Amino acid sequence: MKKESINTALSGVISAANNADGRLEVFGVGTNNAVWHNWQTVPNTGSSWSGWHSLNEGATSKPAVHINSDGRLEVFVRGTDNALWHNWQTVPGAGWSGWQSLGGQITSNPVVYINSDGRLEVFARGADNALWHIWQTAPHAGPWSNWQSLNGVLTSDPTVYVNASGRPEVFARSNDYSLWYIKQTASHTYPWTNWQSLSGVITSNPVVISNSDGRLEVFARGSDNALWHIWQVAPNAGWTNWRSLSGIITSDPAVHINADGRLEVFARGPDNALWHIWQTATSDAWSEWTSLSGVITSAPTVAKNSDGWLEVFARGANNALCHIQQTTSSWSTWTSLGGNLIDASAIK
Ligand code: NA
Numbered sequence: 001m002k003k004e005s006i007n008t009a010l011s012g013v014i015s016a017a018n019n020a021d022g023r024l025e026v027f028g029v030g031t032n033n034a035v036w037h038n039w040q041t042v043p044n045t046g047s048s049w050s051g052w053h054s055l056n057e058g059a060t061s062k063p064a065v066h067i068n069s070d071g072r073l074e075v076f077v078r079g080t081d082n083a084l085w086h087n088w089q090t091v092p093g094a095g096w097s098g099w100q101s102l103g104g105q106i107t108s109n110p111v112v113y114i115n116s117d118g119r120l121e122v123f124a125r126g127a128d129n130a131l132w133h134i135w136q137t138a139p140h141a142g143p144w145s146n147w148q149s150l151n152g153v154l155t156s157d158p159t160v161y162v163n164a165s166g167r168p169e170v171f172a173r174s175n176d177y178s179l180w181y182i183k184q185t186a187s188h189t190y191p192w193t194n195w196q197s198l199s200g201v202i203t204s205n206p207v208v209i210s211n212s213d214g215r216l217e218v219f220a221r222g223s224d225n226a227l228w229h230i231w232q233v234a235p236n237a238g239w240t241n242w243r244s245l246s247g248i249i250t251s252d253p254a255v256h257i258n259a260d261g262r263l264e265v266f267a268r269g270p271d272n273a274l275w276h277i278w279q280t281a282t283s284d285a286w287s288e289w290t291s292l293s294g295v296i297t298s299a300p301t302v303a304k305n306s307d308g309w310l311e312v313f314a315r316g317a318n319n320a321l322c323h324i325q326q327t328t329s330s331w332s333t334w335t336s337l338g339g340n341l342i343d344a345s346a347i348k
Helices: none
Strands: 014-018 024-030 035-039 064-067 073-078 084-091 094-096 100-103 111-114 120-125 131-138 141-144 159-162 168-173 179-183 207-210 216-221 227-231 254-257 263-268 274-278 301-304 310-315 321-325
Touching: 014 064, 014 301, 014 310, 024 073, 024 301, 035 073, 064 111, 111 159, 120 168, 159 207, 168 216, 207 254, 216 263, 254 301, 263 310
Parallel strands: none
Antiparallel strands: 014 024, 024 035, 064 073, 073 084, 084 094, 084 100, 111 120, 120 131, 131 141, 159 168, 168 179, 207 216, 216 227, 254 263, 263 274, 301 310, 310 321
């Protein structure tokens, strides 16, 4: 992006969260363009699922869900008016409010962050291709703020994570195909930094996560269709250069931190199987690319159950939601959670 703007692959087809009681719940767009959801029924290891239930209305983005600091799930999606809409549990685990508009005009999928004080905050690309944000004005409560611009020129969904100083950093691809980012500070006069380049040539949505020690790390597909990554050399310090983890990935990458405190990345491979690769140590050590097989037609979505094990979801050949999970001793078989999912991604 130019100076004027610096002053402040297949996507996944679901968003997942844990309920206050640990139960996983997934949100996706069905063939009728409505948001549907499906949850674990019991706050218990080895739970069955509910089956798909409709939240009605009309979705034009991938949905995003985040738990409030009072335990209530809240889901966000772009509506047919290209405004941001939301719907929340009125008590932890049940009783959806129904959809209400937060307005704006957004041109990416919305991503959700929770501030250290418990205020939800949503980041999305605007009609002017700048990053915009909107927030709860009180912990787990409306009203929401007006939309505010953070400038920039975005060509991807933004990706956000809390840094070692408890504040958000937001990363996005720009119109030079490089990764740029902004970081929130304590400063009154400059609460957000100006957009800063981390270079690279990126051909997927990027995804940021924290290592167990607070070092932020970003994953993205490169121009060679390999998985690339870049990380902080110490908590809240400067970044490495871009380093290749090789492979050929045919979706956005997904990442989580496993029970060993190691980052583990999932992506679709060129055989349409699910592949994963993980840190084997702190310093400069990853596993080989490893196949979990299956046949998938979306990026994977990774979540973590209340026993601390990773669960992975992806669209199957029949548009059902495929499912595979880490157990105490191995990876499970592939099972289907059914449904009929579309890719309503706003950034495609
Ligand atoms: Na809907």
